[PDB]
Design an enzyme around this catalytic site. Sequence first.
Site, PDB file in Angstrom:
ATOM      1  CE  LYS A   1      -4.721   1.187   1.660  1.00 17.17           C
ATOM      2  NZ  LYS A   1      -5.907   0.745   2.478  1.00 17.17           N
TER       3      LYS A   1
ATOM      4  CD  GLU B   1     -20.019  -5.017   6.879  1.00 20.31           C
ATOM      5  OE1 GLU B   1     -19.713  -6.109   6.345  1.00 20.31           O
ATOM      6  OE2 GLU B   1     -19.485  -3.935   6.565  1.00 20.31           O
TER       7      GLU B   1
ATOM      8  NE  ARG C   1     -22.157  -6.674   2.134  1.00 18.76           N
ATOM      9  CZ  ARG C   1     -21.086  -6.628   1.358  1.00 18.76           C
ATOM     10  NH1 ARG C   1     -19.930  -7.161   1.745  1.00 18.76           N
ATOM     11  NH2 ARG C   1     -21.164  -6.017   0.178  1.00 18.76           N
TER      12      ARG C   1
HETATM   13  C1  TPP Z   1     -19.271  -4.303   3.070  1.00 17.07           C
HETATM   14  C2  TPP Z   1     -18.214  -3.210   3.354  1.00 17.07           C
HETATM   15  N1  TPP Z   1     -17.832  -2.957   4.603  1.00 17.07           N
HETATM   16  C3  TPP Z   1     -16.925  -2.025   4.880  1.00 17.07           C
HETATM   17  C4  TPP Z   1     -16.344  -1.292   3.848  1.00 17.07           C
HETATM   18  C5  TPP Z   1     -15.305  -0.185   4.207  1.00 17.07           C
HETATM   19  N2  TPP Z   1     -14.080  -0.181   3.375  1.00 17.07           N
HETATM   20  C6  TPP Z   1     -13.918   0.596   2.279  1.00 17.07           C
HETATM   21  S1  TPP Z   1     -12.355   0.274   1.667  1.00 17.07           S
HETATM   22  C7  TPP Z   1     -11.914  -0.862   2.858  1.00 17.07           C
HETATM   23  C8  TPP Z   1     -10.603  -1.641   2.986  1.00 17.07           C
HETATM   24  C9  TPP Z   1     -10.622  -2.764   1.947  1.00 17.07           C
HETATM   25  O1  TPP Z   1      -9.351  -3.338   2.006  1.00 17.07           O
HETATM   26  P1  TPP Z   1      -8.822  -4.215   0.705  1.00 17.07           P
HETATM   27  O2  TPP Z   1      -9.888  -4.984   0.057  1.00 17.07           O
HETATM   28  O3  TPP Z   1      -7.945  -5.278   1.197  1.00 17.07           O
HETATM   29  O4  TPP Z   1      -8.076  -3.251  -0.400  1.00 17.07           O
HETATM   30  P2  TPP Z   1      -6.762  -2.316  -0.078  1.00 17.07           P
HETATM   31  O5  TPP Z   1      -7.311  -0.874   0.470  1.00 17.07           O
HETATM   32  O6  TPP Z   1      -5.809  -2.968   0.853  1.00 17.07           O
HETATM   33  O7  TPP Z   1      -6.036  -2.173  -1.356  1.00 17.07           O
HETATM   34  C10 TPP Z   1     -13.022  -0.974   3.719  1.00 17.07           C
HETATM   35  C11 TPP Z   1     -13.050  -1.886   4.946  1.00 17.07           C
HETATM   36  C12 TPP Z   1     -16.781  -1.588   2.540  1.00 17.07           C
HETATM   37  N3  TPP Z   1     -16.296  -0.895   1.381  1.00 17.07           N
HETATM   38  N4  TPP Z   1     -17.703  -2.533   2.336  1.00 17.07           N
END
Ligand code: TPP
Lengths: 560, 562
Positions: free
Chosen positions: B238, B313, B341
Amino acid sequence: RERPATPLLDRASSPAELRRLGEADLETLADELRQYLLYTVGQTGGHFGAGLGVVELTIALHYVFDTPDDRLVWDVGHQAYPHKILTERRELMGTLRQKNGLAAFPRRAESEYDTFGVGHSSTSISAALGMAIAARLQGKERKSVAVIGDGALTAGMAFEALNHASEVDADMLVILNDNDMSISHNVGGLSNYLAKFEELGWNYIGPIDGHDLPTLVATLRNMRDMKGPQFLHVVTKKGKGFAPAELDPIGYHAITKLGPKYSSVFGQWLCDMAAQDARLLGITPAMKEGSDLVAFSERYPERYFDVAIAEQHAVTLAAGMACEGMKPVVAIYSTFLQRAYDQLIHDVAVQHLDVLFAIDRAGLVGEDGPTHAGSFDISYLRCIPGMLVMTPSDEDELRKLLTTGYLFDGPAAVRYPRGSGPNHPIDPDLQPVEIGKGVVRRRGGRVALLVFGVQLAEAMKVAESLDATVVDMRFVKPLDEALVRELAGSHELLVTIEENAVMGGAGSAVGEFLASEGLEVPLLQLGLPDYYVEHAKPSEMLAECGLDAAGIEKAVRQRL
Amino acid sequence: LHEIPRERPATPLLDRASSPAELRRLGEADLETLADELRQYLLYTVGQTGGHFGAGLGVVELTIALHYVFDTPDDRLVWDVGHQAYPHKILTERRELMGTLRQKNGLAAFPRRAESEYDTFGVGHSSTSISAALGMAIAARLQGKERKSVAVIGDGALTAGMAFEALNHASEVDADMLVILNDNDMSISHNVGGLSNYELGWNYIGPIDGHDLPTLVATLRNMRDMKGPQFLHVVTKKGKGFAPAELDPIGYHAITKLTGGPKYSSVFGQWLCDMAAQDARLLGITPAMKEGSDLVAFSERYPERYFDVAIAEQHAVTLAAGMACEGMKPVVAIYSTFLQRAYDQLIHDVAVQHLDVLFAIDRAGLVGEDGPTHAGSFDISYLRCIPGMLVMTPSDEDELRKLLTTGYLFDGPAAVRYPRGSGPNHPIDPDLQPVEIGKGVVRRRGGRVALLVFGVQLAEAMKVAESLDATVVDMRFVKPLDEALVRELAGSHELLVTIEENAVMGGAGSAVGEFLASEGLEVPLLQLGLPDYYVEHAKPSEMLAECGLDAAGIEKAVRQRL
Ligand SMILES: Cc1ncc(C[n+]2csc(CCOP(=O)(O)OP(=O)(O)O)c2C)c(N)n1
Ligand SMILES: Cc1ncc(C[n+]2csc(CCOP(=O)(O)OP(=O)(O)O)c2C)c(N)n1
Ligand SMILES: [Ca+2]
Ligand SMILES: [Ca+2]
Ligand SMILES: [Ca+2]
Ligand SMILES: [Ca+2]
Ligand SMILES: [Ca+2]
Ligand SMILES: [Mg+2]
Ligand SMILES: [Mg+2]
């Protein structure tokens, strides 16, 4: 059959008494228990096959664990009749699934031996984990055990729970009750692997023979004091002990005591439209039988998708199919659509994708009780922009409104109840009706009954004695505002009727429109009350809720 | 790199790769210089508009390779969540539109089908990509089309239950699709989970270096032509290539472009800490949103009573149910849009059993530049219809504190909803006292019109009320509604007005309307709230004004009804 002779079972009315028997007795106790089970389920009806598969496992668990202090959680709970029989309730089983009798599933309000009211699948690991975390903080020395089927383990929330238990190094035991079965055969990638966990951080043990009480009692004894996340793979046979249930696991999943169903109407529509349009895809989360995709799956195997017990995936998969130009139909009960709500909103409706939801078991479902009631889909669906929301009044309207939502270029919902209808004739054509248009079924005066759904026949009875106007509303969300506006100008009372919660329901949509246009007509909203209706036969539940002719007529008269 | 460029960089090769078609006409020897230029343009433009930052930096090489090896837009690429997809947009005919990004009428925050044929699936919520990709592959094969299908899912997104349901099904239909695990050991917080610390029918390759363009192109080409469920493990960092972002992955998850009261979530965070200091039973749960929901201080002080369940969730709510069975007192911190969800777990495991679980519903209402995929538009509608729910809507910071306390001390399922951002900055009572359930507070006595306000529009309503000499009520409670006060105002005033930051359809206003109808009170009722469509991304102030929910829109609607 009559009450089998079961002298040993009669000495095991509770875990403590069972725990005073000797291991040499367990084997005999199993036969007795299977006999009493077969006997009582035949007296009242209910779930059958899976309970027989866990007779030995249930005896062993209460023999080895300090229940009720040790916490035992059963997934779904349809296999929990033996558990009820060993937990002070053997002699009450004659009331099972009747008004004021034992409920269909474990229920906390019903016994201290039921740690967690279940009905929907796949909640046991999560609940056991939470109990284990709490127990540890409070310094108690409780065991936490979750019994989950290989079908229930296919749900995403079970993977979430297993991942989180590993994280917190939970002292709990997950028992996988693998019998290769769902209601239908278990179809899915995990099923294939189960035919052939430790990675996820779980100490795996087994498989063991789930009908080997000596082994079960010894395996449980050893695992009962191991630390951290423990996972016991047990193998049982659905219907164990009853030949024709072992032969027919699907048919003997549940049995009855010793006009076409709306779901059958849906199934013939699905087959008829599929023969006419190669774009149709039919999706079910493991409810081929209930929703009745049986013929469709045999005639178009390549367009039938059983996603296992994964309501969420079922919906987002349909969204992806809609992106390529196909026409998916998601067959799902109203109560289980609660679990796919976010996928319906975010993946389908926000994108205005062309997906049709065939929402079975809408309204009160009877003996299965409040965990399965389809009470909320009109409330939770109609606040969602883009949703076309329909409420057929009979077999013929179900066919027509299926057709109308299907052809509609967008997300559409058709809800309908368990059981049969008034048996009116069904037009074999496959043509839609105009969207947003109600039908006047009776031209009357003074009071108008706006019916959304299958209470129309009851409202027509009311209407003959009151000479009421009766409207077969077909649409909730594209409301027929023109009709409501004229009715509100020509009558002294508008009455809405719906087999759905009054709060937020179809009547409230009428109410909102009345409020926005300054129309001042009195309004009486009839529907399901704001509490969970206790199990009984469907007619008893409807009467309780005032949704039979007598109930509707009484409330209308008192309003006038 | 160490600074965000303030002037548009020189990107000669990037300017020659405005779409995948022309990107594919460059040569392997150019892609690494393309990546450097892409990375520079990315920093420049995200520093101009604000936006998601670190996740795109890490998929710069991955996105280049994908559009180089796959025949996009014919081959289907699906990005999970979509916050990492700015480079994808830069390479798909939108680089010169990136200056509008996240603005009113400009490019949206995430891939969105109506924005570009290069966005196969609108995302925002996580973990949908495998499902949507598997859906497209099934269709393609039935229409006899030879297209590829690819989902790019982060290690955080893969903790969600639906992603598991999708992998199980894809392997069962023997689908022809590629799943790419973009693994950077990170969610928003660090990825906490059993899956983090780490056959179903897929062919697994890797892991491989997600920043080595030659291995990527080579491997991707290889897997483009293999059949069945294909699974590539790619490892990224990242913030790759922006030192400050690799040094602080959390702080650079998103940035502002290149003073007031506390944030509502900060008020919650403080409430959660104070109540945990005085009750040893309290447990705090978040599904990977410790920063957003602001359980930071709580998680440091009470580590043994803080539970982050990853992006799960559903487990979050059912876990709470089980905690409450043993007499503990769980608080589930969850955004309105994400509580969608866990609806079934709230209903069936919590509400049906009347278990003592408090839901602190953040991001209630319009959420701004993140747009409609994250709007908290519906929680009043989908919760008030559920029996046994206590449903509460605070009007300011002190109300938020008081209603959290009321919901917590209540024995049963309770919900307190509140918007992102800051409030009107009113004094906060340091005490921990609840208020009487089901009772509103008259905040102004006027005549002719009564404003029945559910939540944070109270301040705007008080401005309209002073102009009109109207009555204003701070309703506090939707579900145990103050029936006696509504009835009193219905006889006293000529017009009731309901105001809430939730869909009008099914909303708090309709709870008022249900009550008027059942008692046959015939008073004009004007319901102000969110309209029945998806509000396009803008500044929150701009979205609220579009919906008529500032002082001017309220006054206009009221005076127009009168
Ligand atoms: C169902 C749901 N819950 C919570 C979120 C909040 N959220 C937005 S981005 C993120 C992190 C996702 O991490 P990742 O898939 O591993 O991608 P990275 O940012 O590491 O590249 C979260 C938890 C979401 N988008 N959807
Ligand atoms: C969330 C959910 N979806 C659908 C159902 C319908 N249903 C009731 S029992 C059952 C299958 C049970 O399979 P399994 O877990 O293996 O129990 P078994 O009978 O094989 O012992 C299903 C799908 C449900 N109870 N819950
Ligand atoms: Ca049967
Ligand atoms: Ca005809
Ligand atoms: Ca007549
Ligand atoms: Ca309307
Ligand atoms: Ca009320
Ligand atoms: Mg099974
Ligand atoms: Mg990540």
